[PDB]
Amino acid sequence: PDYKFWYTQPVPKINDEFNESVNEPFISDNKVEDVRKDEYKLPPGYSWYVCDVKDEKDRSEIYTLLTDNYVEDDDNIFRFNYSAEFLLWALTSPNYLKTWHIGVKYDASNKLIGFISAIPTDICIHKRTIKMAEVNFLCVHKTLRSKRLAPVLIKEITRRINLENIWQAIYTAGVYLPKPVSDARYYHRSINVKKLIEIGFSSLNSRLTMSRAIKLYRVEDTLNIKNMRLMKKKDVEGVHKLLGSYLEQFNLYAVFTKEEIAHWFLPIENVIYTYVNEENGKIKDMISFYSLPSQILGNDKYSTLNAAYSFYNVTTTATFKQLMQDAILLAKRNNFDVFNALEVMQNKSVFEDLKFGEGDGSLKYYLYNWKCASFAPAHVGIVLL
Ligand SMILES: CCCCCCCCCCCCCC(=O)SCCNC(=O)CCNC(=O)[C@H](O)C(C)(C)COP(=O)(O)OP(=O)(O)OC[C@H]1O[C@@H](n2cnc3c(N)ncnc32)[C@H](O)[C@@H]1OP(=O)(O)O
Ligand SMILES: O=C(c1cccc(NCc2cc(-c3ccc(Cl)cc3)c[nH]c2=O)c1)N1CCOCC1
Ligand SMILES: [Cl-]
Numbered sequence: 059p060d061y062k063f064w065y066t067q068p069v070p071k072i073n074d075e076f077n078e079s080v081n082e083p084f085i086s087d088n089k090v091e092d093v094r095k096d097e098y099k100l101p102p103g104y105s106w107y108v109c110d111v112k113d114e115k116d117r118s119e120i121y122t123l124l125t126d127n128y129v130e131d132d133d134n135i136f137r138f139n140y141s142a143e144f145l146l147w148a149l150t151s152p153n154y155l156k157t158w159h160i161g162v163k164y165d166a167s168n169k170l171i172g173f174i175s176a177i178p179t180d181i182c183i184h185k186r187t188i189k190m191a192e193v194n195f196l197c198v199h200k201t202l203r204s205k206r207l208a209p210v211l212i213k214e215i216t217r218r219i220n221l222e223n224i225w226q227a228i229y230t231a232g233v234y235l236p237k238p239v240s241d242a243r244y245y246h247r248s249i250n251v252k253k254l255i256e257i258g259f260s261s262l263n264s265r266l267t268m269s270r271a272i273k274l275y276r277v278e279d280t281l282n283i284k285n286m287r288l289m290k291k292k293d294v295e296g297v298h299k300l301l302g303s304y305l306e307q308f309n310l311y312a313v314f315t316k317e318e319i320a321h322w323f324l325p326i327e328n329v330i331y332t333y334v335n336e337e338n339g340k341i342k343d344m345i346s347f348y349s350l351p352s353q354i355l356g357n358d359k360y361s362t363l364n365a366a367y368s369f370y371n372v373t374t375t376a377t378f379k380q381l382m383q384d385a386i387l388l389a390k391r392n393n394f395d396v397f398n399a400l401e402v403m404q405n406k407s408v409f410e411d412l413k414f415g416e417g418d419g420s421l422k423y424y425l426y427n428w429k430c431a432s433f434a435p436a437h438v439g440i441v442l443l
């Protein structure tokens with residue numbers, strides 16, 4: 059790989075190695091005045107479109123583009139199917155900019171063929187807190203792949219983020235790019251065993267028959283933490299303290315305001331699930347997971363796999379194993395087929411005992427315009443959508 063685009067950007071070369079004495083931008087002393095005020099040029103017949111994610115019809119156009127053209131596994135079995143309600147939540151966090159929700163239309167058809175997004179957040183990297191853009195949902199229509207549209211989308215969102223006096227970004231991808239700050243494998247905990255086998259995801263053998271697999275993954279319908287309940291507005295201050303206190307140990311985390319805690323955790327059916335344990339007026343434990351279905355490609359029976367993804371989990375009255383056992387149970391109670399988690403924070407410590415299987419690859423964490431030491435994924439304290 060030559061990285062002809064990426065090697066023009068303020069990111070590390072593949073064989074760049076920085077030690078912990080280095081924690082700073084590649085390019086400092088940036089001036090909003092000097093940022094390009096012209097939109098990047100698109101190929102003839104294509105136009106920039108500012109998407110209004112709060113408009114049901116604009117949001118439906120993003121939904122359709124991602125449904126048909128977003129992330130697949132390397133074997134083209136699954137395609138991520140973020141819901142329209144999920145995209146509304148993901149993109150309208152506190153102080154979001156509409157103008158960071160960037161579409162490209164094909165003029166002749168008036169159809170959306172490209173998208174990229176960012177939201178603003180404070181990110182703490184090796185104890186330094188920096189205002190950053192969190193970039194996600196980069197997507198080019200399958201009919202227009204390998205035409206160098208992605209670098210146009212990346213340069214245009216970089217320009218718009220820079221106009222807000224923001225000079226760093228955080229992003230994740232399954233593909234290897236220059237250069238990860240950390241790299242986390244994903245693991246899966248089967249809940250609906252029979253469905254996962256029927257779609258070709260989970261395997262059986264002469265030792266693990268269907269009946270034995272169903273018994274292996276069977277869940278007792280009783281919580282270790284009896285009073286775990288859906289989070290309410292009254293719990294925002296307590297979750298801010300419990301989660302905020304927990305995250306300070308990590309080398310990379312979001313520094314959440316109380317308004318960001320309310321946005322990212324208060325529950326929304328089929329989008330975000332947060333449960334809390336309240337003891338003596340204090341929030342002492344929390345579980346959270348988001349809903350991200352996958353379309354099961356070419357399957358006539360099942361249109362989607364209903365997957366819960368581990369978000370943020372903290373325990374002070376139970377073991378981390380007991381807490382994540384309760385997270386699996388709460389996902390089962392909410393009709394999820396599988397519980398997915400990355401080897402970030404304390405997660406890898408429970409994967410063997412709670413019968414998670416290792417997945418087919420890894421999610422890489424990246425910073426834009428930041429040089430620093432890389433670290434093991436247990437020191438990652440942030441989960442992007
Ligand atoms: C200060 C503010 C800064 C803000 C910006 C921060 C950076 C944000 C960066 C974006 C974070 C996004 C986070 C997410 O959303 S990760 C999810 C990405 N989306 C998908 O995987 C959906 C399915 N695939 C697609 O839609 C396309 O394949 C995409 C759009 C991904 C590439 O389109 P296409 O396949 O038609 O290729 P091209 O000819 O246009 O372009 C080829 C160039 O693009 C580089 N490439 C390929 N994949 C990715 C990728 N996932 N991140 C970054 N760069 C990527 C590639 O190495 C090459 O450059 P180089 O190798 O020649 O050098
Ligand atoms: O095998 C997959 C799957 C589905 C789609 C894509 C991929 N691989 C690539 C990939 C991965 C992920 C990913 C997968 C799991 C987790 Cl916990 C966190 C991130 C993100 N971005 C990617 O590009 C893997 N599963 C397991 C069953 O539930 C849906 C996800
Ligand atoms: Cl350029």
Ligand SMILES: [Mg+2]
Pocket residue numbers: 198202203204205206207208
């Ligand atoms: Mg292209």
